[PDB]
Amino acid sequence: TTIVSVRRNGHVVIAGDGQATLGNTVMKGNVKKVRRLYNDKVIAGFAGGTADAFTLFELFERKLEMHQGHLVKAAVELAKDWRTDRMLRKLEALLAVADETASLIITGNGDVVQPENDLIAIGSGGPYAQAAARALLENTELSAREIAEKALDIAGDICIYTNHFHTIEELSYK
Amino acid sequence: TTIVSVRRNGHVVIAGDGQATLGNTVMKGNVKKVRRLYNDKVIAGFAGGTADAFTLFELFERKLEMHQGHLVKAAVELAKDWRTDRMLRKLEALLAVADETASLIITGNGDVVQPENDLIAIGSGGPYAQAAARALLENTELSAREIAEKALDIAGDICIYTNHFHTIEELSYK
Amino acid sequence: TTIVSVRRNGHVVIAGDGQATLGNTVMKGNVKKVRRLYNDKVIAGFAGGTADAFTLFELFERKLEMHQGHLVKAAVELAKDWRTDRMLRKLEALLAVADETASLIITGNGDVVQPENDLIAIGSGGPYAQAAARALLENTELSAREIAEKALDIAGDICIYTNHFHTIEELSYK
Amino acid sequence: TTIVSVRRNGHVVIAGDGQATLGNTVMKGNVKKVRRLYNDKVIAGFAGGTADAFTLFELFERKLEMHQGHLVKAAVELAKDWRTDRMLRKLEALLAVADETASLIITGNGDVVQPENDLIAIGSGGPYAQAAARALLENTELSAREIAEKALDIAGDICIYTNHFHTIEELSYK
Amino acid sequence: TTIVSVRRNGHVVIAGDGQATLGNTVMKGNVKKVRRLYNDKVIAGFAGGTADAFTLFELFERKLEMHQGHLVKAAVELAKDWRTDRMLRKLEALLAVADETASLIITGNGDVVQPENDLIAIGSGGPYAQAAARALLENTELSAREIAEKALDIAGDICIYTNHFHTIEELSYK
Amino acid sequence: TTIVSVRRNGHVVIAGDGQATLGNTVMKGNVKKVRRLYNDKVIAGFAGGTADAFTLFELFERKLEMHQGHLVKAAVELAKDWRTDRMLRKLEALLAVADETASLIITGNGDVVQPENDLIAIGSGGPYAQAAARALLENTELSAREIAEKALDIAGDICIYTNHFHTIEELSYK
Amino acid sequence: TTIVSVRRNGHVVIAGDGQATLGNTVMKGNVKKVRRLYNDKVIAGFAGGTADAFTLFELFERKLEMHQGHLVKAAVELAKDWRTDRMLRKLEALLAVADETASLIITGNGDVVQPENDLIAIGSGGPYAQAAARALLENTELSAREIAEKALDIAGDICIYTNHFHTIEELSYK
Amino acid sequence: TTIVSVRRNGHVVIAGDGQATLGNTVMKGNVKKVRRLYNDKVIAGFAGGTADAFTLFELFERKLEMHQGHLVKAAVELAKDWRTDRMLRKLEALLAVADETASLIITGNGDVVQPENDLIAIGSGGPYAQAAARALLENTELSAREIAEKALDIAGDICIYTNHFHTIEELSYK
Amino acid sequence: TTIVSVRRNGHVVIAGDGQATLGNTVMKGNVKKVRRLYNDKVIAGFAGGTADAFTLFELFERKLEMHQGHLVKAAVELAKDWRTDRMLRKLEALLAVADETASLIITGNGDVVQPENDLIAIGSGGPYAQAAARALLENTELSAREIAEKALDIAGDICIYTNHFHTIEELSYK
Amino acid sequence: TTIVSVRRNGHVVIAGDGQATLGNTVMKGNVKKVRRLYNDKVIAGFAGGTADAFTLFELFERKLEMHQGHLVKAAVELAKDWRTDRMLRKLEALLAVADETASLIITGNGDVVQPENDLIAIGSGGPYAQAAARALLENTELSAREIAEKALDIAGDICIYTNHFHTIEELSYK
Amino acid sequence: TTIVSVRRNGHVVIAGDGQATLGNTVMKGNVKKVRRLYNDKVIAGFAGGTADAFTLFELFERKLEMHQGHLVKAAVELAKDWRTDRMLRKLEALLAVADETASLIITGNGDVVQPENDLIAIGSGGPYAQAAARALLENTELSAREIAEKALDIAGDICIYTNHFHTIEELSYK
């Protein structure tokens, strides 16, 4: 799976493919890896278990209620619980979550990372996506969405675990 | 890679995809895995190294000169040399080779196998292809080529190491 | 083992084989892998412990009583407790469950999955069944049952862990 | 160890050898691997720890008190507890248990298996015993006991972890 | 990563690089590895989870409030809870913390360590920094800062996991 | 390391970085990975032993003298001896070689490969270069050189085994 | 073992420690790891077997006779033979060799490396030595010998496989 | 690390080196591995974690309060708790502890060992120390301290994980 | 280590050696592996932690007080708590315990074992003792003691983990 | 397999069992592991391959022709060839060979061993046999043959890879 | 095994133990590890194959005849052929050889080594001997012999692979 987030001109997106792999075979090709949270004010993508994600995203909206939409703070409370809690600790996922404020990554290792230009590329195909996203951001006037999409397809072309089915969520605050 | 051979009504084909994988990434998407040998009277596909194949196919045409096109005999002489010879022994490939006479597999283990209905499906995607080829052969009046193709695409859909680029070689003796 | 579900024309089936393996030998050849549930309105197949099964399917029916036949909801509840309950967590299986509404998979991870066309193929022989089910579904008029069947035999013919003993549970609705 | 159960003409037996192996050496040659439970109405054999078995068999008689001798039901309650309970989970054994009703296997994996003709053959020598038991059941008019015994000796001859010391328990309901 | 502390002439620094690695690729190049604490009387560098850090440094300040700036004591308290608390135990990091009093390391093992000359060099690039810090400290008049710097660049020049983005937190006292 | 070749508008380049790694440290930062050959009519990049290189590129030029600049043919000859000669077999590398005719890869396996659009990206940083080269090639008018460059920096920015020292060998023909 | 070569002001040195380690114990503390070759015009150090080195250095003087003291050329002929020859291939060492012309490393992988300022640091302690050598070269007016020595001692202090026994060979061409 | 205890003529000592090793590098050279406990009436050395030791030694003084300085009894209570307690169980150290009564070793395996002449030599260098201590005790009239010291240095000379920094604690009861 | 029990003519002994090993060296040569219990009516040998032992044998005596010398019963109780109690579970050993009644083994698994002729041989040298004890028992009139002895020396002569220091605890009854 | 040689009163024997084990199963129970060589003047047993032995014993008779029956000399010539020769090196066996002169072992490691009293016990059951043989030799007036036999049976009783089928060869020179 | 050489006051000895081990048991207890050579002017000890030895020591004497007693030279010749000759290469051992001139080690690697004070300690018990030899050599007036002896016993007392059977070969010269 590959998940890409690009942010440009009051527009931030999160795109992901839809391949689920079991060993050396495709189990499902249309997994929805990107969704909306917190009255649609937040976009998010995840690598790994769907139910695992469902649980982590729910908790996140929760932490968000507790910090008035402050992305980062609620983001850390989750990176906090995630590593402490005996149950959450067992969960396995890679969260990519964004809003008008900022974009960031959330790992089970109690980490909240905010890459260089809010450019996120997680998943087995992450780096390939990042590489293309980078090339495009710095040499074309393309939109966030256009980049996320063209980047993700490139990833899809190189990464054996990423396909071409997409799901995109956008956020405009301009 | 997946290679499928189907034989129906004086028509025998050999189809293969074109993915070359390095670790978890696609190195090349249009590898030509099927070709012609012996004044076009023989069709052949291979899993593994291209140069490796080139060497083994050359020798095969050779063995064919030595047995007047007798597929099987020349096939075994190759399965013979392949395991004995200090150099060939190092080669690694999976040969699928056919003519109007019969279709067969040739392994470095000095094996020449002729599956149940001349139906061959080698490669990481082999079984998936075989399964579809089987379903189609026994429930539709489709041509060899149609089956090889539809089977290969199915393989391509399931196998993470097989793509949708095809190369087909057909032989009509009707 | 191999479990295949197929829904075509107001008919939806679940078919499984009967091999129980241990190491490299067959412990049992007639295991019942497909049963009925919720006053025979729901069908289901399972890969795993026979008792494991008996506890999950019971709980399911239970969840169905709590959501009046709403397949999905109960399904999500089950997958919900399954990954939470300290007792249920140790249980291991692969339920394939379906009714006139929809077909779907439940994995101990807590995932409820709805494959592309209500086509389910779980178990080591899973993909070989899928491959053949797909090929039949897209190139013949055969009935949902006939497909599960033929697919399953093909699975059993390739998978060293799947045999030819079958169990089918159909369901007509239109 | 090898444990064989055969049932023929209102006569069901359970036979087992008596070897205990430590690494590559025989630690004990007369281990009693078969015994009686529930006012002698039930026969049982076990592969693995003696104390482990003692604990599991005790609980089983218990579950039997709770289900009026209903073998199967009490059998599952045990396959249930066995996988759930934090303590039992650590136990390691393979239970073979029979009565006039039916014979079955009970694994720590929450499994209760009833082989094809109530023919059970568990243990490193299981398959060899099964193979002989099968040959004898279908080609001679021999008693359950005669088969169990001759089968077990054959196992003993082939399996390096099974000896020729026997313990048999029989049950006649004719 | 690489964290270097150096104390010479009433000046004590902590300098770290900014590389975040995952597998064989760079996830982030500008991580803030060195921050300030206890009303900016204390400096500190950390190798590990960004949130992990945020929880430890907070607790530290907390411990400092309980021992009025007594670096060491608070440091021992922190290392004390860290290996005891069921939540804190799962946290993983490497704090380098220091003030005019003394410089020191705190490891999740519960160790508070005071290296030979308040010279700290933690992280995969640790020793290459040490090696160069030592060489500068013993053969030049350079300032504490200048050393941490130069040392760190040298570290980044050798360590595949350390880069040239820096973060320095000085402290003058005399 | 990372070697990128790119051919656009009668211009074809080969660009490589200069990092030499050993374990987790940098042994050299300025290795010359791209040189010229055949009286400067041919360009080439190589990943591997510096002497290894020196023997292969020499032999190549030699093969070119035997096929009057026919890139491909010489290339096949080289790949031919390389897998045969008892001395050459032990040599390990990855040549990327190209001229106005065509660009291509030669692997010790004996393979001569011509990637989709004369786009070559070999080395651990290979795919990150590819990903970015592809993105630039398909969304900007940039020159072949400019792409190799930018691509390579992006590679070096992600790959822990690739740096920013470059070596470029262009070639104009039209 | 650690071997350091520094070159400054018409003065080039090669210093090495003298520890030989067997498992976790010191077998010998005064191994002579540096010596002179080719009528004293060449200095050299080696990591690994003494006899192994003796053989490789002999051959090197030989190759030197064949190339009129041309260090580099003779250096490559050795990196050539070393990887080809069936006997030499088995040898295991790391050669560091210098003259007034230049300093370089010679590996069994058919590699001849000339680090950035003729600064060589091979051996388990290599990097630590390099780091100190670097710090000293760029911040003090110290001689080659002084650096090699102070660097080597630092290495010795950090590397568990390097001691403080030294052997130095110098070369003055000023 | 190496820890040696020798007892001769109403004089018992405990000597240890001060090396802390991280992988293949020296992290600290002056670790204090020997200390005093219980109003100075008890001497003690430890191999492993400092904080780990701190915790175990504290508890030991405690157990000592509970058994009126009876070394052995309090020693066993600690070997008792150490293996039982869920927390202590995780601790890792090797205790060497002595008083005028006797000297002994205390392992996490619930073991309290009193070597042949109160001669203790634990740590990676233990055996080498023991060997020298033995030679000296039985062939010279040297004091406990002299032996501990000369033995420890020998260890230090042979063991790659032991240095020459010492800490000694003596006890005179004559 | 090696523990041998032998009962012949109203005499029953337990004999063990004294080697304590760690890695490939001898930590102690005089460990007391055989002691007395229950007001010296019962003898016993143990392989394992010295403190571990001290806790088990105490509990045993305790159990004996609860079943008036009924060796077996107490033995079963001990083996019962041993595998249940959360504290006792972590304890590891091998008790050989016996009296005029009977001889037997107790393993942390919870097993109480009575070997063929009250002949016990536990420990790495176990079988070599058994082999010799058996040979003496069946071909000579030697006393129970004399056998344990001679057997044990033979054990010590073969087993690298067993020495010639002995501890014997006899018992006459008739 | 177990092979025992005993020599007493001008009588020397070689006894061996007859089990051949494949994995965990008995493949053959009457393998002849002992035979005669050199006009019956020499007795011999072997552990391992039969054909392997056949080849080694043939060569031995040969070496014997070349050294006039001098056991030892011819024995070493074989231990010589065995390790040198490119073909013999691949052979795997354990030779036990005796004559009136002396008994000895011959390993592929170029070793010729003459145990303490010409007492040989090789094979997985070797030690158990040796232990019994020892006990018997030093406490009974039994013949060589009686010991070899009783020892071998004991081995057979303990060793899971040795059975009770025997082959004995004796030699009387009195 | 353990071989100790010690030269003090015109006396030089070589002493070895006699244990031959295989797995975890003793195959022989009286192996002769120290012999004489070159018309008894030279002494030597060896760790390894008994025949292996016999071939090396012979060749040595041979080399000595070619360099008139020049220990070192012959020693270098031996180490020279040893790593070259296709036959000798497979031989494995550890010669310790010495005369009035000097003492030294020869390893199959081709190394001739002269340890610090003609003190040799090879074999698994090597360092424990060294440790004690050093301690005696530096703190007592004992003779070379007496040291080798005492050292060796100490070795045998610690090393599980070394025993107390000795073989000493002295040499007086002054």
From Swiss-Prot, chains A, B, C, D, E, F, G, H, I, J, K:
Keyword Cell membrane: no
Induction (UniProt): By heat shock.
A GO CC annotation given for this chain: proteasome core complex
Keyword match Hydrolase: yes
Molecular function terms from GO: metal ion binding; threonine-type endopeptidase activity
Membership in a protein family: Belongs to the peptidase T1B family. HslV subfamily.
Alphabetized NCBIfam families for the sequence: ATP_dep_HslV (TIGR03692), PRK05456.1 (NF003964)
Protein name: ATP-dependent protease subunit HslV
Record gene name: hslV
